[PDB]
């Protein structure tokens, strides 16, 4: 036990759990999931007196399924997850998931060519989660062709700008509740070009942040036992927060 000293004490024994996940998605233009996984980690910040033996339980009777695991070299073999945490802040585990993942957003691209002069683009996004949860830091990136002379854009929500030097329309929305949908409409004006090879369209890209594990993971409990000191599990104050953030999250179109 060279990761936790002997005489630690706090009146007000408190712990904070961070469940951090990025969800990666590659999706066809028709909505077929081409590829998807979640990698996550649990960070624990604990202020607990003595030498507490903790037990971390989650909804993974496998109720979600974990493909892989790494633990802080403080957790013990079996069965459940057992340990005496370092004081303060540390990483409890890294994990990976691929099954029955929740895709917070569904991106629906629509692209009509109009003569050789113009591209009409409509993109719809749908919040796929409880209506009482709020997503934020939503960003949709629509690539535009090299020979783009300019862009018109309308959107009833958020704000959108063409950035030429980046060749993308960037759409920003502050927050969006689950079970909603939003449109963006763009008209892309084209310069004459080499009629040979077409536009090899990069996928439409997305960023967002949601207050839940897209893997579906829930902390069932964290239990503290310190056989010696007056305090017990019920004296401990416990908090959790879930942040699911987009990793690579693209929809071909």
């Amino acid at each position: 036990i060279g990761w936790r000293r002997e005489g630690i004490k706090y009146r007000r024994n408190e712990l904070f759990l961070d469940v951090l996940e990025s969800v990666n998605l590659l999706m066809s233009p028709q909505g077929q999931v081409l590829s998807a996984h979640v990698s996550g980690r649990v960070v624990m910040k604990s202020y607990l007196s003595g030498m507490p033996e903790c037990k971390f339980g989650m909804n993974d009777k496998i109720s979600i399924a974990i493909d892989d695991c790494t633990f802080h070299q403080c957790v013990r073999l079996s069965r459940s997850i057992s340990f005496i945490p370092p004081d303060g802040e540390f990483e409890l585990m890294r994990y990976r998931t691929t099954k029955d993942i929740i895709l917070p957003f569904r991106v629906i691209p629509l692209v009509r060519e109009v003569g050789r002069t113009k591209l009409e683009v409509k993109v719809v996004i749908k919040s796929n989660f409880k209506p009482s949860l709020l997503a934020q830091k939503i960003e949709v990136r629509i690539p535009t062709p090299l020979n783009t002379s300019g862009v018109q854009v309308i959107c009833m929500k958020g704000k959108a700008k063409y950035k030429a030097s980046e060749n993308a329309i960037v759409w920003k929305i502050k927050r969006m509740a689950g079970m909603k949908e939003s449109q963006i409409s763009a008209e892309i004006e084209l310069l004459p070009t080499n009629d040979k090879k077409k536009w090899a369209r990069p996928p439409i890209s997305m960023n967002f942040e949601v207050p839940f594990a897209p893997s579906g993971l829930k902390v069932r409990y964290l239990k503290v036992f310190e056989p010696k000191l007056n305090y017990s599990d019920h004296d401990v104050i416990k908090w959790v927060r879930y942040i699911g953030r987009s990793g690579i999250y693209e929809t071909r179109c």
Binding site: F16, L20, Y242
Partner: peptide, 8 residues
Amino acid sequence: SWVYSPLH
């Protein structure tokens, strides 16, 4: 990243 909630 967000505001904490009671575990239970």
